[PDB]
């Protein structure tokens, strides 16, 4: 039933905010949280979540590097990136590295839930 998610961000209050939005939706089980990219990748390997929602600029290994690695490993997880940067070549390159989508940090509570749920379903 609930869509299973890993959330990754090195800003605690943004991460907490996302985790609460997802958890309070009633439709999402946050199975792991990370504050750096290598840890996010390891949680993805262990939990095999439906969706990973990851900051583009995670330390150690950025969101697109993790997306690339997940696709390279052929894991079932869809990696949705979120960022305060929205430059065309950055979004494009991330999608080229296998990111399922690219969201902005100005997203609302219902927008992020819907993005995660739509991603788990399809796109």
Swiss-Prot record:
**Which residue intervals define the domain Response regulatory in the entry?**
4-120
Task: Please provide, alphabetically and separated by semicolons, the GO molecular function terms listed in this UniProt record.
Answer: DNA binding
One GO term under biological process is: phosphorelay signal transduction system
Q: Where in the cell is it found?
A: Cytoplasm
Does Transferase count among this protein's keywords?
A: no
User: What are the entry keywords?
Assistant: Cytoplasm, DNA-binding, Phosphoprotein, Transcription, Transcription regulation, Two-component regulatory system
Q: Which domain of life is it from?
A: Bacteria
| Post-translation changes | Phosphorylated by NarS.
> Is-annotated flag, keyword Transcription?
yes
Report the GO terms under cellular component: cytoplasm
Q: Which residues carry this modification: 4-aspartylphosphate?
A: 55
Q: How would you summarize the oligomeric state and partners of this protein?
A: Monomer in solution. Interacts with DevR.
Functional description taken from the UniProt entry: Member of the two-component regulatory system NarS/NarL that regulates genes involved in aerobic nitrate metabolism. Upon phosphorylation by NarS, functions as a transcription regulator by direct binding to promoter regions of target genes together with DevR to regulate their expression during aerobic nitrate metabolism.
Q: What is this protein called?
A: Probable transcriptional regulatory protein NarL
Full-protein residues shown here are: 7 to 129 of 216
